[model samples]
Target: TCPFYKKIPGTGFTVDAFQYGVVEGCTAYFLTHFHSDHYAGLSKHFTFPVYCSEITGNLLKNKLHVQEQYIHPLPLDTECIVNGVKVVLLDANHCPGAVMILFYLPNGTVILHTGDFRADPSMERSLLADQKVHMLYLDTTYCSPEYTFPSQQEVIRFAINTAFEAVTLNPHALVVCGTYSIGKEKVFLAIADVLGSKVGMSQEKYKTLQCLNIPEINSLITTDMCSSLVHLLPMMQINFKGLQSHLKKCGGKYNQILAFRPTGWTHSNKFTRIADVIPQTKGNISIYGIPYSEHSSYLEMKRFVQWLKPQKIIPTVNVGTWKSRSTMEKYFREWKLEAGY
Candidate 1:
């Protein structure tokens, strides 16, 4: 299989190969999202056009600095033809514009590239019917039994509840929420909508949020730390040392700082279930680690695999880690549990 297409035996088109397919200079390229890792070899002066959701396209052009002319925006849920193959986009429910790409190949096999999506029940029948999912290029980030965290919605509620408790306990404390640049906009927006206030953001995040067109997210520039009760900052900005330095300049206007990071890594022994708070008491900053994930857990993956009944499952992440193609295949062979799985 080429780095580009995975070369479906007879399928004319490819899916989610980024520039690897573009590098081939002939096959079609599909970009699931604007995640830097996904477009590793892609550059501004690239040699091809890639199809993706509108949101992914916007970020690719604006943030990644890719040339605008190369991006082709594909509408979600609508069936379209690309290079003689039928394609449909399903809302990934991961990030604002993330999507699941369904490739109906000319070879009669249906391939699904679930870029990075939380499973949504509403779209179940759409996928299970007609062209049934034959192959699934899954986002198996949490593909271990250790990750049995709650769904995205449940975690959002937990984050909101925890934030309210923090505000009540420390009246003048500034709440700082940390998240990745593209993902976790939901956490910040959920807090604002539930608390009936606005989330403060830096200039870069504000522009990205605006492109999402989410009305629930009311955000403004973060000039002052005490300006908003809940200040949404990138996870990279509010580490222990960084918060300590900023709190020193608080001038007692906001006595303490509370932080919430909605992520799947919190599904440790520390947390019993979704929305359960990981206590960070007795520290200058009180932090609550909540469970919020976009990818499917091991159990979820099991169910999905059974339902879709793909001939084989490919773990996207491990592909890069494997030293060689033969070793990758051997590892996947044992992982798939050909007999049991």
Candidate 2:
């Protein structure tokens, strides 16, 4: 159902707020992506007009499916005005349709809000890391010094090799790569690309997959579809416990099977880090660790911060705010980072 649209007045002439999206009169609220943290609020809270990519708009319509009138798709790489601020959308490269936004205020304030992003120079050089940004709000959730992952290119190689090895070891092996539904879906395709297959997954895996528009190559194998062909999950979204029973009673009679993930079989007293059920299986398994992160690492953050050279860099997209005096002091002191322009 479409809600009523009304343009409310703003604090100054430069700003215009609509009482239909987030803030009833705050001009416009820039949305970086359709992550739950960002869009969940819109269910009952958002009344202000939202500016995002077409992908986001369609997602909002399907996810919420209530206030379709409030969201308007602003095409990628396009610029528009909300209130008096210039809102420019850029490629997020995180999720399929994820995006980054730039809010240019009339007060000479150029704010760069990176939704969720990474700086990996795979086959091509980085589009960011070399761009000029002022008043940047960075994603620092994984900014801690200890957080690290292998390069994207390296992860791609690992996914490929692992998939190939899994099938070779057990023709009956499903080659299941467990990961998140949205962002991690890319890894599945990336894996298939290396294996010379298209995006494909089992019907069981398909039910859990999100953003399921990407073309799949073939279905690997399952109780219903057993052809011993290659497939990609598009995203590895599987129920660990359920898959076990399915695999246990799978069409083929196999004693043991192999899958991907370094920590999948880890035995923990309590479900702590990477909460996924460790399959108690009857077959040999191999877990591989490839450094792949959606966000930059501590070292990467440190280098980006220094290159930014801002007086005070505020971290965003986490539980805490970037501007707390304690945070600023702590970054330079404890984190060994120089937060500047």
Candidate 3:
């Protein structure tokens, strides 16, 4: 499901479909967030009007240099009419500026397009709880039973405790946390705060944080590498060899390297306690692959679907083939039936 699948079946609007080029019959484009995969086809040459949250709009303007006129930053929970279609944005807890869009068609059909989200109990307080949704564009990233990883808070605490223990064992150990360009800020931020250390990152990454307007981020981050032992790096550079190279470059200021690779892919259902999780360790290098995810786990997704009980569900991820799509559809059907839909 590439270009055509992104288009809403009954509307002239496409959600996260920029990579597909000008989708025929779509007049407006909606970006759920500023992730590269969602905004792949968007560039200086793009001409369509783009709708996104204010933070995402700022990211598009500052990060990708997309024109301002085509970007419309919609306020959260407020209904706005776009080409006579009623649209509202709801906070998607996955990332900053991420939103789950509610599209009210002219014929009274309500479609909830969850771009990507981490569902929690707080969502029950939202307006979405009251609506009888006719269709749902779901983020089915972790739709399988195997993806029942711990919650974000649990993972963050585990990361903090793990890093603290590592640092306590060796006061001179340099803690390096891996992150993507957008998500996983909470993990490193919490670690830095708990350890009373500044985070070191590239100017570009620092600028991205600035775009989010995170409180007191200026004091928390530094462009100077030597200023902070808790360094933030791209996910690719968190491996054993990468840590070895970084330690070599550090020139013995820090004797050991403790890296946290925060991602959900590292999680396994067999691991009950966060402390029981294993790490990749070398002589002086330890890389802990923490289960820090932005996407909803299988149980979260199941609960959300059960609560909302939409009439139909169209998965946004893991739909590359008929087999994959069918597998997800089976899950959706089972969940929907259980919801009494």
Candidate 4:
């Protein structure tokens, strides 16, 4: 039931300052993150010599396998006037490769474009930006106030404690987690802190982690990043293995194992139907479904959009309509009235 995040075709114009895709009129182009939604159709279509944060470029190089000629990398918070436009990159507080974009137009317009993101102020550093933004294009995935997301710090604590408790229950079992190479760094940190070891990673992940000098962890077995870990290690990342019957039965012979599944995996309603679709096995695997999502929820979408106070809001994702956007908009209007907006 892995949820799909696909970026559909749309005008390249951003929400901030009505930034159009017209290359001749707008000289500066900044990249917020490398997620398929924001990055796709840009590097190939818009050829203004795109600039991105350093790690963002590396992630594209390693994960997407895009060539460096397509990327011009720069460290965050460094201001530059490329093509007579000012640009800066800041953390988006969502994942390792996430970034929020800041743009200053030649017309003296201050624009803030927060790419797909989450608000984990506790874990991430403070955003170093100040301006009366003429336009704010917010990541309104979670704009409502009803969704109850335990703070990022709370999620970290719970995940760490749960992993530790698993190990204590069965000391010998190996634990492997499934997360995206770019965004799953947090899961690695949790495993490291709880298991106290370094987990083997893909060549791309290892290179990027080395660039960041991530601390050593106890959960990790080998010092090297090798594909052999897929066979040697007891724990492995299996987000979309599509073992339907195995997931339903959930029977296994392993002594001890700690595993994690990513969020947003959807399932059909009928168990018998799902069973019919899955080929039966001798119960070789046990799967656990974890309700963890990196994307914003209905409430988060409303609250962030309220922060922007946008003249109008545009929805992105077709997986779920959520039906909460209008609900939050009503309360937001009340809030603005009280704030004297």
Candidate 5:
């Protein structure tokens, strides 16, 4: 039976979050991404050294206030040996600087922490060529058949098209998208690129985007009010209550606003098939929790495991409750058998 954590025989290398009794004695700690759940216990003032991708390192220092001296930033696809394990970070396809850790143990055991990633064929280049993962720590966020959804590219297109339709319907209206701190950067960047409009951000997200140093989006991100017709704001900055007050505050400076929340949870039913354009709109705002997720659906996960063919599968999260390992195991077994593996 695979467990959540694996400790090396003689080394002090442990893979757990900071506050989870792993602050001391561990020679290295690998952070998969900047999502709050994965990096939850991490504090600005950490005692031990933390390792993550360069983009995540920037978030750690700038966003989370972690000290540079205690942070070890590793670039994607680069190998760094620590305590006899060859650790390589591959693109997790989740968010900016999100990575999957491939640990080549000295004893010939390969351990892979998928972190949080979407299962795409592109991942085969980095994962499947000449590798045999002994243990796979899965990020099975959507571990059931009920989670099938569209790809991120399709979702981005849908989001941009929705925004365009909204603007076309009401020319003077400003479009606002609700997104988390990091994942939806691509969607917003595409919105700006396609619409030829300068996207506005709050000071916090603007700084984070600037840290990415991507030229395609660098010039597109702006805080100027007059630069464009669209404003790409974070989720916390705009909601029904927040937008209502802001609309009242705007007082006819523009027409009604449009808000879109892109996520995989939009497809709540098994019978819900893909549509040319799917949008759920409230009174004054619109939300399309598009399947713009980083995690794999149930079928995606099953295919990944079949290809990788790891000896053991250890889910990183419980199915529904934190205390029910049996529930997750049964859930995984059903899917695994259904996948014909």
Candidate 6:
């Protein structure tokens, strides 16, 4: 799972490069988040020093069962020296433990690695605002102009209102939300709050939520399947066949099912309005593909790059393919020119 570039030049550190094994000249490993894609290679046998947010550290030990000595949980917005290189962690706003890593080299160069982030307006007020970044390793998950969508709050509002309307009209409908191991918690959480229902999930997910250390989360999750009408399932299982089997497994407690599959890719300019992204139905199962993304939208990424005006940009995602990478570079050049850099 090696990206185009894993190890930062002129540094002994590697960010999200675990899958590549021990790279030459890399002394320390940095994880931006606890998502499987970022921490894929990390395992109990890992021997390298890992620097990440406290929440991510907890997940490393609790979820991955990594040794405590190898896990180093750095505080947010604080500077810490690693191998004589000055480093800092900033809130990424993408997930619970996600962060944007900043490194200051002795040669007067600043590198910003946004692991997987949603470009929020509040980021501009952080320590990054006053400093000039030399290299920006960006999360180019949605670098294309077609990936533009509403803000997280706007999408959450839409999901809540839509789910509420559906449930109100049909009280017998069971609401199932599609989610990964991490991220997209806000979408389902908001829907649960509006519906005034507890969320049902597997015991493993419940344990994972506890690691988040959010007290409110404890009240929202339940292991008993029948206790909550709003259930959390894997994204792959939100389809018609999956929902049909899930209904049978639940002993046909609910006659109909309303599922929400949230992701950034669901949004497109072809749809006139956000609500126009229609739900696909088969038999008694109806799945609404909502545009609730953890990654920054095209416009948001543009704003972030323009505001930062970094000397150079390196794409972190969508770089495995030549055509996708070339298209991303095209956007990067346009953004740099617009920034007057």
Ranking by TM-score: 3, 6, 5, 1, 2, 4
Pitting candidate 3 against candidate 6, the one with the higher TM-score is 3
Better of 2 and 4 by TM-score: 2
Cα lDDT of all candidates, in order? 0.68, 0.51, 0.85, 0.50, 0.72, 0.86
Q: How should the candidates be ordered by lDDT, best one leading?
A: 6, 3, 5, 1, 2, 4
Off by over 4 Å in 1: 1-22, 216-226, 266-271, 274-276, 320-341
lDDT for model 6 comes to 0.86
How many angstroms is residue 78 displaced in model 4 relative to the true structure, after the best TM-score fit?
A: 3.1
lDDT against true structure, model 3: 0.85
262, model 5: CA deviation in Å?
Answer: 1.5
Point out where model 3 deviates above 4 Å.
Answer: 1-4
> How many clashing residue pairs appear in each of the predictions shown?
0, 26, 0, 22, 0, 0
Between candidates 3 and 6, the one scoring higher on lDDT is 6
List the candidates' TM-scores in order.
Answer: 0.84, 0.68, 0.95, 0.66, 0.88, 0.94
Q: For candidate 6, give the lDDT of residue 22.
A: 70
Q: Model 4: which ten-residue window has the lowest total lDDT?
A: 1-10
Candidate 4 positional error at 120, Å = 4.9
Task: Judge candidate 4 against the unseen true structure and give its global Cα lDDT, from 0 to 1.
Answer: 0.50
Cα lDDT tens digits, model 4, 126-182, are 343244455555555545444444444554565566667666776544455665535
- Tens-place lDDT per residue, model 3, 127-234, is 887778998889999888878777788888888898888888888999998877698889889998888988998989888988996788788888899878799888
Among the numbered candidates, top TM-score falls to 3
Q: Model 2 Cα displacement at 14 (Å)?
A: 16
Task: Please give the lDDT score at residue 25 for candidate 6.
Answer: 80
Residue-wise lDDT of candidate 1 within 88-202, one digit each (tens)? 8888877778888887778687888788877655556774566566677777676556767776767877777877776777677777788675777777767655665667766
